[PDB]
């Protein structure tokens, strides 16, 4: 699988549980939220591609998804109880824990760098032709 493909299921399933109607609408989206979380935990983030399995950040990645399944684990057994309130009210910390693993400025100053080299080479070539061409 892929990290951000699991966040393609984890983002849109996170915003549906907040104001939802019945207890299965909590419970079906929580089964999407748990099962994509363990598959992302096996993965590797792309900015830490070249390291070891036993790196200090990669454990700090891999215990950093134990917190998120553990903060899935708060709203699991309340969702057996039929509480429409206590499921979504305990699940408000999921957006804070997406913020703590956002793991990107040094790559994006190649992308804005490369498009100007294919913009200024248009202007520098067509500008000289824009001067000299009616005398010749």
């Amino acid at each position: 699988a892929d990290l951000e493909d699991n966040w393609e299921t984890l983002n849109d399933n996170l915003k549906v549980i907040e104001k939802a109607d019945n207890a299965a609408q909590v419970k079906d989206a929580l089964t999407k939220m748990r099962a994509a979380a363990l598959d992302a935990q096996k993965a590797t983030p792309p900015k830490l591609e070249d390291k070891s399995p036993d790196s200090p950040e990669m454990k700090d990645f891999r215990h950093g998804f134990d917190i998120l399944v553990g903060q899935i684990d708060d709203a699991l057994k309340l969702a057996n109880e039929g509480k429409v309130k206590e499921a979504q009210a305990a699940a408000e910390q999921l957006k804070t824990t997406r913020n703590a693993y956002i793991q990107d400025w040094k790559y994006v100053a190649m992308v804005i760098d490369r498009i100007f080299l294919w913009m200024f080479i248009i202007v520098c070539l067509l500008g000289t032709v824009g001067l000299f061409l009616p005398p010749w």
Partner: antibody
Amino acid sequence: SEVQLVESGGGLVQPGGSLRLSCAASGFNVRSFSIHWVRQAPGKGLEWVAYISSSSGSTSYADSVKGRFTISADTSKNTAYLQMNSLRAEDTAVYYCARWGYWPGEPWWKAFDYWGQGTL
Amino acid sequence: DIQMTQSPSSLSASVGDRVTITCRASQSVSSAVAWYQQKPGKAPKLLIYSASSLYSGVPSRFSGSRSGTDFTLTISSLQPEDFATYYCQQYLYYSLVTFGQGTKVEI
């Protein structure tokens, strides 16, 4: 040195009635382990009944047994007590008690593996 | 729920031969498949936990394989001491645990 789990209490329920099942877990603790209960209707595959999480007392019943089943446990002598009210003959099954470890860790990935001798 | 489609329910194949057992889950389970050998009437035993890994005390002629939704128990040298009612089983969350219907080889 081994973890062992002993299933007992098997017999007849009078029709309409109730009965309590006992699982005695010898060798290990129950306060850091969820204990599940799983039956096998005969001539078939497998079909899960209910569970109890003894870290907080909490239990989950299936849609077969909601309203009719009630589990508790004693943490002193490592025992599980399952309460069966208003049964049927599709409950006439092989009953096993079961172990599961907790998140995080490799013992979460360790599934059901200590399966007992079974009661009818 | 998350149903579990066994294939096959029963089979009949030779001594020593390579036998495949496939199972397809009905929605996304990450890595949680456990496979079980079920002998006639005794205590059941676990062969495969985490969908491809051997149990600590199971022979290494058996193995498992996940590939997305496909979960497959492979038997290389199926000995005469090995016939059963086999089980794929999910273990995602404690209240939604479903089994397989079983795979019944006899020797």
